[PDB]
């Protein structure tokens with residue numbers, strides 16, 4: 285029956301579903317989403333950063349704890365797979381992680397968990413850190429690449445003279461220059477999630493080697 | 495002093511001060527030049543055209559690697575060099591991500607990195623997965639580091655809120671006895687080119703046993 289942090293966070297995400305651009309998320313907008321005035325949002329949030337911190341924490345809460353089996357490879361795999369599902373459930377999820385500091389217990393214990401799995405498995409403190417942060421990097425860059433390329437492909441398929449023109453120029457160049465490999469590369473889009481798992485298993489196979 | 499090169503530069507300068515591509519507008523580029531939007535449009539039909547041109551401008555600066563014919567080594571050279579290229583331009587990752595690779599330089603590089611793998615025996619789908627996964631690694635790697643230095647700056651220049659958050663983080667690690675997160679602290683480190691180089695090698699190491707599992 286009254287304004288709460290939760291009511292605002294939901295409105296923020298609701299706002300992102302409409303306009304999936306985190307930089308466009310302003311306090312006034314979030315206010316108008318609730319039919320209120322910006323000043324009201326500030327009673328619960330000092331600035332946009334405080335709102336982002338809460339949103340990030342909100343996302344973490346939806347993470348599904350993976351079923352661990354004691355195998356460092358599978359377990360870490362289960363973790364990354366579940367983060368892939370999570371980041372696929374909220375708009376700008378990656379940008380939100382990127383733009384905030386993990387100052388919430390939930391996110392911290394997951395990171396500590398993934399790292400321990402590797403440390404307890406015999407990996408160097410430096411190598412477990414590289415591994416875990418590297419896997420996050422792969423997911424971050426893949427999710428946004430996919431998010432931004434989905435839009436581009438949509439604009440092209442939605443009659444967009446310019447980009448369409450760009451796409452044709454691209455395909456002609458590849459052809460006129462017999463760029464075989466790039467040519468077959470276009471073919472794939474390639475099941476996204478499946479691709480991600482393949483990339484991690486590959487990284488994981490590399491750890492196992494040395 | 496108006497020309498594509500001048501517009502392009504003004505954009506990058508604009509981003510240097512505030513490396514958030516989402517804030518780049520035709521109206522802001524014009525202001526940066528001391529002109530109004532219409533003038534700019536005579537050079538670019540829209541923001542997307544400016545980005546395409548900016549993506550090209552970035553690729554043109556790609557230092558051609560010296561290859562020897564070995565897939566592991568040559569592919570590593572390409573990534574080391576792409577890592578250097580993305581340290582020279584603000585928002586290089588976001589720009590390549592929000593543009594289609596229709597410019598020559600890009601196509602030549604993508605097709606040739608994929609050529610390194612295909613000729614070495616890697617299946618078409620593993621070559622694609624490998625080449626794009628390495629780019630994904632670098633992209634997330636560079637975006638994460640970019641915000642990092644920005645947040646670090648904000649804290650230092652007196653941002654009390656963020657300073658408080660960094661503090662809370664450490665309090666939780668201690669309150670919940672997060673032993674591994676604590677040791678994780680001593681890593682500045684996982685932001686250096688060698689960390690990226692180590693990440694790429696671990697991936698190429700996996701490749702010597704994957705989709706090699708799917709090769710031949």
Ligand SMILES: [Cl-]
Nearest residue numbers: 305306376379
């Ligand atoms: Cl975003």
Ligand SMILES: [Cl-]
Nearest residue numbers: 520540541542
């Ligand atoms: Cl426009």
